[PDB]
Structure 1
Amino acid sequence: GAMGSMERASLIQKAKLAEQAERYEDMAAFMKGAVEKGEELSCEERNLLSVAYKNVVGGQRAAWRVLSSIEQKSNEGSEEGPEVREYREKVETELQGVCDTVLGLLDSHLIKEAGDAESRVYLKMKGDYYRYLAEVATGDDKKRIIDSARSAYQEAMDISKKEMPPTNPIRLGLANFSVFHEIANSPEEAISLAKTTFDEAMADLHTLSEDSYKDSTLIMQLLRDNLTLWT
């Protein structure tokens, strides 16, 4: 609501300046305010939204994994206070808010108005931020958060299979689903999806310009290293 009196174009301009500044909280705040203007988002504006929230949740995820480990060492001959647990909690509570903020923007109303394949294949974002909630969930809803993410990934997978070529960078990035398969305890599903996705992009590379070629090979290489680490 903070950005409600600033112009849509002004928020886009300041979101890119925030990127250059590496002020990713401002960048998320601008792009949230841009989303809340009610207009659909251009392919470029989609990337600014995604890039901003990825960096904020990305440092929150990094800090959480640091605290969680000191906390595990704290409970194994260990000299005993609640301070590690309290701070790991607060940071995690902060992380859960940011995911809940992104999911609320996809749900109001970015997914319902996304009609084209490229825009709708937001469901990936929806899968990513439930996966982040999954990474920290330990209770009576961890099974339900995982299904929330899996279902979102699977909707994006069906549209991407039917509507985009096998080298399409959005399809290749979507095929994160494989890493979910570290959350879902399905490492064979993880590896099959990656070798299948890789091999079919490889067979389609002859159709691509030198520019498209470089884009697709980038993400195929992220699949190659993952396969390399799992095999």
Structure 2
Amino acid sequence: SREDSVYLAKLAEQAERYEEMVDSMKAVASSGQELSVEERNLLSVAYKNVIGARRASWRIVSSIEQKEEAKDKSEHQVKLIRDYRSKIETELTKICDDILSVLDTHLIPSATTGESKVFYYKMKGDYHRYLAEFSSGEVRDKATNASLEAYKTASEIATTELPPTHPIRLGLALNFSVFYYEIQNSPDKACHLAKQAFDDAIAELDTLSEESYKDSTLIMQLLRDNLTLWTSDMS
């Protein structure tokens, strides 16, 4: 049953068992049916948490790898770390390819609303960006261009279909600006986008209900936090 899968996804979230949460939402997402706002968020949280753990692991093992590289003798040791990092990289790829195939096959094609289109192309940008984070060469360049194209598509729809305060549109600007800064190494692009998104939203905040206001300003704070961070790095 479908409503049961959703309920179990919610249980799994509370239990912090995110791989199960993914299994349940993937099953739900893999019907013809468009997801509700709640189901979209459940899907997104599930995968965010599953990939997040691996990304966290990858960053740690990477740090260790280059610290052991810099005590040169090593070698058999560095090999063990390399292969371990590679194991984690395989997992990351698999997780990314999983949600990306769900987005390409089920979610993006069945999306009728502007909200849902922006949401899914944003997610597509995110998982290609995760792929770009640890890849090299042709593989990285392909993931980068795919990430950029999906974020651009999301942005074109958001720009025309969603108000500037919409949390989906703000969250897009947040992640897209992060893409620019971290993946493309493009600070001007990143700061311009984050600032424009913040500013555009600031204008219409006084038109929002309490709940909408809370949702928007939470993301707008993340935008300002990144802008704060980036402008101080560049100094």
What is residue 83 of structure 2 aligned with on the other side? 86
Which segments of 5 or more consecutive residues in structure 1 lack a partner in the other structure? 1-6
Separation in 1, partners of 2:72, 2:53: 28
What TM-score results when the alignment is normalised by the length of structure 2?
0.93
What is residue 179 of structure 1 aligned with on the other side? 178
Separation in 2, partners of 1:152, 1:164: 17
How does 1:1-231 map onto structure 2 within 5 Å? 7-80=1-74, 81=76, 82-121=79-118, 122-175=120-173, 176-181=175-180, 182-231=182-231
Separation in 2, partners of 1:37, 1:157: 26
What is residue 4 of structure 1 aligned with on the other side? none
Aligned-partner residue type, residue 103 of structure 1: L
What TM-score results when the alignment is normalised by the length of structure 1?
0.95
Q: CA RMSD in A?
A: 0.9
Aligned-partner SS, 2:72:
coil
Which segments of 5 or more consecutive residues in structure 2 lack a partner in the other structure? none
- Counting aligned pairs with the same residue, the percent is 60
1:74-110 Cα deviation digits (max 9, x unpaired): 2224331111011110011011100000000001121
Q: Which sits farther off after the overlay, 141-150 or 172-181?
A: 141-150
Kept after mapping to 1: 8 A contact 2:177/2:191 = yes
Aligned-partner residue type, residue 127 of structure 2: Y
What is the deviation of 1:139? 2.6
What is the deviation of 1:150? 0.2
- Report which of the two has the higher share of helix: 2
Aligned-partner residue type, residue 42 of structure 1: S
Kept after mapping to 1: 8 A contact 2:32/2:110 = no
User: Structure 2 vs 1, CA of residues 147 and 193 (structure 1 numbering), >3 Å: closer, same or farther?
Assistant: same
Separation in 2, partners of 1:226, 1:75: 32
Aligned-partner residue type, residue 213 of structure 2: Y
Aligned-partner SS, 2:48:
helix
Separation in 2, partners of 1:76, 1:91: 22
Separation in 1, partners of 2:34, 2:163: 24
1:143-188 Cα deviation digits (max 9, x unpaired): 1110000000000001001011100000000000000001011111
